[PDB]
Design an enzyme around this catalytic site. Sequence first.
Site, PDB file in Angstrom:
ATOM      1  N   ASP A   1       0.764  -1.377   0.078  1.00 32.88           N
ATOM      2  CA  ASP A   1       0.133  -0.069   0.082  1.00 32.88           C
ATOM      3  C   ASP A   1       0.673   1.220  -0.029  1.00 32.88           C
ATOM      4  OD1 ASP A   1      -2.300  -1.634  -0.187  1.00 32.88           O
ATOM      5  OD2 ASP A   1      -2.936  -1.223   1.832  1.00 32.88           O
TER       6      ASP A   1
HETATM    7  N1  LIG Z   1       0.793   1.713  10.607  1.00 30.16           N
HETATM    8  C1  LIG Z   1      -0.507   2.012  10.882  1.00 30.16           C
HETATM    9  O1  LIG Z   1      -0.669   2.625  12.017  1.00 30.16           O
HETATM   10  C2  LIG Z   1      -1.459   1.427  10.280  1.00 30.16           C
HETATM   11  C3  LIG Z   1      -3.059   1.590  10.804  1.00 30.16           C
HETATM   12  C4  LIG Z   1      -4.030   1.216  10.271  1.00 30.16           C
HETATM   13  C5  LIG Z   1      -4.014   0.810   8.884  1.00 30.16           C
HETATM   14  N2  LIG Z   1      -2.710   0.857   8.140  1.00 30.16           N
HETATM   15  C6  LIG Z   1      -2.704   0.710   6.920  1.00 30.16           C
HETATM   16  O2  LIG Z   1      -1.957  -0.490   6.489  1.00 30.16           O
HETATM   17  C7  LIG Z   1      -1.014  -0.427   5.512  1.00 30.16           C
HETATM   18  C8  LIG Z   1       0.224  -0.777   5.525  1.00 30.16           C
HETATM   19  O3  LIG Z   1       1.006  -0.843   4.571  1.00 30.16           O
HETATM   20  P1  LIG Z   1       2.326  -1.535   4.193  1.00 30.16           P
HETATM   21  O4  LIG Z   1       2.969  -1.287   2.586  1.00 30.16           O
HETATM   22  O5  LIG Z   1       3.230  -1.802   5.253  1.00 30.16           O
HETATM   23  O6  LIG Z   1       1.701  -3.275   4.244  1.00 30.16           O
HETATM   24  P2  LIG Z   1       0.462  -3.550   3.223  1.00 30.16           P
HETATM   25  O7  LIG Z   1      -0.022  -2.556   2.093  1.00 30.16           O
HETATM   26  O8  LIG Z   1      -0.450  -4.524   4.346  1.00 30.16           O
HETATM   27  O9  LIG Z   1       1.371  -4.734   2.464  1.00 30.16           O
HETATM   28  C9  LIG Z   1       2.190  -5.557   3.380  1.00 30.16           C
HETATM   29  C10 LIG Z   1       2.740  -6.787   2.211  1.00 30.16           C
HETATM   30  O10 LIG Z   1       3.483  -7.663   3.087  1.00 30.16           O
HETATM   31  C11 LIG Z   1       3.815  -8.800   2.327  1.00 30.16           C
HETATM   32  N3  LIG Z   1       4.064  -9.880   3.172  1.00 30.16           N
HETATM   33  C12 LIG Z   1       3.309 -10.436   4.184  1.00 30.16           C
HETATM   34  N4  LIG Z   1       3.845 -11.359   4.792  1.00 30.16           N
HETATM   35  C13 LIG Z   1       5.151 -11.298   4.373  1.00 30.16           C
HETATM   36  C14 LIG Z   1       6.525 -11.792   4.673  1.00 30.16           C
HETATM   37  N5  LIG Z   1       6.467 -12.793   5.542  1.00 30.16           N
HETATM   38  N6  LIG Z   1       7.487 -11.690   3.903  1.00 30.16           N
HETATM   39  C15 LIG Z   1       7.632 -10.771   2.839  1.00 30.16           C
HETATM   40  N7  LIG Z   1       6.487  -9.873   2.699  1.00 30.16           N
HETATM   41  C16 LIG Z   1       5.180 -10.315   3.149  1.00 30.16           C
HETATM   42  C17 LIG Z   1       2.298  -9.269   1.582  1.00 30.16           C
HETATM   43  O11 LIG Z   1       2.230  -9.848   0.571  1.00 30.16           O
HETATM   44  P3  LIG Z   1       2.402 -11.288   0.228  1.00 30.16           P
HETATM   45  O12 LIG Z   1       1.176 -12.187   1.163  1.00 30.16           O
HETATM   46  O13 LIG Z   1       2.646 -11.806  -1.273  1.00 30.16           O
HETATM   47  O14 LIG Z   1       3.806 -12.078   1.239  1.00 30.16           O
HETATM   48  C18 LIG Z   1       1.408  -7.728   1.808  1.00 30.16           C
HETATM   49  O15 LIG Z   1       1.887  -7.394   0.239  1.00 30.16           O
HETATM   50  C19 LIG Z   1      -1.466   0.962   4.724  1.00 30.16           C
HETATM   51  O16 LIG Z   1      -2.673   0.515   3.975  1.00 30.16           O
HETATM   52  C20 LIG Z   1      -2.129   1.714   5.915  1.00 30.16           C
HETATM   53  O17 LIG Z   1      -2.995   2.497   5.440  1.00 30.16           O
HETATM   54  C21 LIG Z   1      -1.700   1.281   8.849  1.00 30.16           C
END
Ligand SMILES: NC(=O)c1ccc[n+]([C@@H]2O[C@H](COP(=O)([O-])OP(=O)(O)OC[C@H]3O[C@@H](n4cnc5c(N)ncnc54)[C@H](OP(=O)(O)O)[C@@H]3O)[C@@H](O)[C@H]2O)c1
Lengths: 367, 369, 177
Positions: C105
């Site tokens: 994301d």
């Molecule tokens: N930080 C906060 O406080 C918070 C709070 C609420 C919401 N959010 C939302 O959460 C999201 C965070 O974004 P992000 O880019 O950090 O994460 P993300 O958009 O949820 O994507 C994380 C990626 O991690 C990959 N993954 C999972 N396990 C893995 C592993 N063991 N090894 C390698 N890759 C792995 C997954 O794909 P695979 O299954 O192909 O491995 C997934 O595509 C944002 O959408 C934000 O809006 C954040």
Amino acid sequence: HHHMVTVAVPKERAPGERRVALVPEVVARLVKGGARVRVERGAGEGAYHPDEAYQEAGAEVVERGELLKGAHLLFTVQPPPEDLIQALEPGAIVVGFVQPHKNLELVRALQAKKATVIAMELIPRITRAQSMDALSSQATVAGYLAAIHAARLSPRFFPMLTTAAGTIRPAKVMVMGVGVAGLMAIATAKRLGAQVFAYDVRKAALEQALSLGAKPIELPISELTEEEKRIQHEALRDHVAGMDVLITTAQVPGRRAPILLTEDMVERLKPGTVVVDLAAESGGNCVLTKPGEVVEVRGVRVYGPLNLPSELSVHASEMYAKNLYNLSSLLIEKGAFAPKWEDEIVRAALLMKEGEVLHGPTKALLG
Amino acid sequence: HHMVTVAVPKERAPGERRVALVPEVVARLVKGGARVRVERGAGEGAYHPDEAYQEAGAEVVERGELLKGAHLLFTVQPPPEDLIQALEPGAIVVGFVQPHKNLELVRALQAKKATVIAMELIPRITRAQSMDALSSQATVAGYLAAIHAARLSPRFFPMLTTAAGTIRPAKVMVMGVGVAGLMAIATAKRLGAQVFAYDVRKAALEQALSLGAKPIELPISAERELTEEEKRIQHEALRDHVAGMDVLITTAQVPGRRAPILLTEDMVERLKPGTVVVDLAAESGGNCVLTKPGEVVEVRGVRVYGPLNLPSELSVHASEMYAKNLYNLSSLLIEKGAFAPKWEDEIVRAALLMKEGEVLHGPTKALLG
Amino acid sequence: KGSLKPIDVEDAAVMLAYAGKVVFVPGYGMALSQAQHKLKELADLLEARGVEVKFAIHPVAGRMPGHMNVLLAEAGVDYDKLKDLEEINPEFPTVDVAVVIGANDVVNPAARRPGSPLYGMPILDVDKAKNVIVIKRGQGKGFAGVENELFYAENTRMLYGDAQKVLTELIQALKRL
Ligand SMILES: NC(=O)c1ccc[n+]([C@@H]2O[C@H](COP(=O)([O-])OP(=O)(O)OC[C@H]3O[C@@H](n4cnc5c(N)ncnc54)[C@H](OP(=O)(O)O)[C@@H]3O)[C@@H](O)[C@H]2O)c1
Ligand SMILES: NC(=O)c1ccc[n+]([C@@H]2O[C@H](COP(=O)([O-])OP(=O)(O)OC[C@H]3O[C@@H](n4cnc5c(N)ncnc54)[C@H](O)[C@@H]3O)[C@@H](O)[C@H]2O)c1
């Protein structure tokens, strides 16, 4: 040929004291080694060790008046009070902290009684003796809570946090006096994510601070012209000014704590800055420190904790009990009462024998 | 109208030390074209002196002059009656409101024809993330929960080896794994404790694992309303896990409701003397039957703390984050220095509690009834 | 549209061995994998090799405020290496390789467009880097449940696997060059 040894452990009575000299698990090693251990009813309640637990360890739980009956060794945290001192038998050795400057009238009564006492603070700060070093083990405890109390009093986060609500910069924490306590203060503040700086006169303590990932504070040099002293002061005042937390630990045995934070220094601290003065028990490193209190002057919050080890009463007692256990290798042999008078450690810590004060500075203070 | 002018008062609620805007944020608003009025002493709880607000471009004034000519009132807690009575027509109040705690203040606002945006009602959509004040303040609460627990515990958090032997790490259970729970898990973990996590949502449990914490695995699937028999099984399994902890941090709260009990009396009876509970849900009932809100109590050697304004302890960073949330939200209230509320914006629509005396939020409506 | 372009660790190793500037972009997946130690060790290695290394930390990377900071602080990464997008963004055109570790994301260029449930979220301009290697296990979507065109860009190569395991192998292959 030696008597079979009985070790006694009192319930502590000093104000705000919660530690106990032996914990049940350490009693059990002593029993298994062949010693008898008697313990005063409710001795370990401040450390959450119930009487039942000492009984499972192999101790006899007894009333205070019976505690020193037939006892060769009295293990204490604080020096024993008058009621225990008068019940001391011939041949018996008191082992515990004594600290004469603070407890002089008790020292006197022990001498009038003709006691033998090993003062835990007189354990020589050498290699062979670290497992017995009660000052260290309680210094580690104090430095830990010092870091915890600083984070509690600070109105700012320790860690760096990058957030949807902006980027939080880490706290700047300076530990002044990097002995055993300061080093645990460093490790603990670092665990919390702070940027840590370390100040000490000795290069070795700074190299040690460096290994924990603290940044050492280097002054323009390191008697001196009055002017170099001033340059030296100013440069330190400058480093301190940009900190959010000062934790100060410098203590000299038998003398007052050095002032490391003078009035012109604390005037440069931003409102919201926190000082944790671990040296409050010998006068404090900070001129604003009120022993046992928290104070706020110009929004600078200054805490002078006394008896930190007593907050962490479970681990403080465990480690002190372990210190006493290791020290007892010099006092107990295959369950027999066999003091090793010849041993360097005993010689260094033997405060008085049969009423004879063998510690020079204590001899002087009593005079 | 005109130049938008925003007002920020000195908070007066018991224990409240935050301020709605901090100087650095005040300065950014002034730069953008806003006039800012700040009550004398408003930033003192957070170590921001009147002079600092003056440097940022703010006029500093008496409480009675605060609202004169103001289009925006930014608060932490809802404005007391003395401020409600000074609201000018078309002015918008923005801050936490919590009508369950402050019903009669909400009634006075309605009678006054106020318009209010409640920060608790900011919607959970991507656009609103940098405005999420519930999240920013919970992050503080979770941090300090871990700190207080280490402070009240008679044991080390970290594993320690010295010449005098080895000490086991503390066993910490965080119960309720939202934002506050996660930051508590992370802080306790860093201090070296062995950290466990209890929550019904699988995704919360995955998140706790992403912090090196250990999911508490119960017998039944919690993901459905349970039968009376399955509840007995879950409660007994959980009680066993709670029994072996040195620290419990409970954080479960439900908006507008009394907190769920997570630590019933039969559970706490299994807790060893010297165990610590930090009950973060005390403001709403508490998760633990022994909790006395605002106090530390000890019963059977179990230390229970129910803190009520942890964000106000960390007043500097709480206010900083909060002020940033309002600053971000103000992009929906201010456009090129002029008062310009986007009534159509989904974020405004979700959080607009009241508009000129008309209560738009259904649950609050019911409550006023 | 474009294509997914799987790459082998040995190819990723070659790309990294010769780069002047590397930016590391950790997301939730790094956290799930607890890959922070392997990540820091790769950053030590490159630095020892003369590579300029930085970390790009998205405001909402992970699942809790400051998620990446806490893991990276645990690994022992210096705070000075951690940059936020305001400071790191403009620097992206000069990044020889941008390495995405379990982020999705927070690097999705669709966030610039109104229809996306990610709209209104500021994004890390990883797409403006010279080269992008993305580490994830496979096809898993992120929190918002949307596809990510970044993985289909010309300069983007997928390095599939668990983040700790992939980083370990990357280090091992780099020590052999
Ligand atoms: N930080 C906060 O406080 C918070 C709070 C609420 C919401 N959010 C939302 O959460 C999201 C965070 O974004 P992000 O880019 O950090 O994460 P993300 O958009 O949820 O994507 C994380 C990626 O991690 C990959 N993954 C999972 N396990 C893995 C592993 N063991 N090894 C390698 N890759 C792995 C997954 O794909 P695979 O299954 O192909 O491995 C997934 O595509 C944002 O959408 C934000 O809006 C954040
Ligand atoms: N070879 C060595 O490395 C070496 C040499 C001498 C002493 N020591 C150690 O020093 C230890 C002191 O015991 P502790 O660990 O309880 O320390 P402590 O709590 O008694 O002292 C606090 C620390 O403050 C420092 N300090 C003292 N006065 C200071 C001042 N005016 N300004 C700045 N810093 C000041 C000291 O160097 C010490 O490191 C001795 O026990 C011994 O273990 C080590």
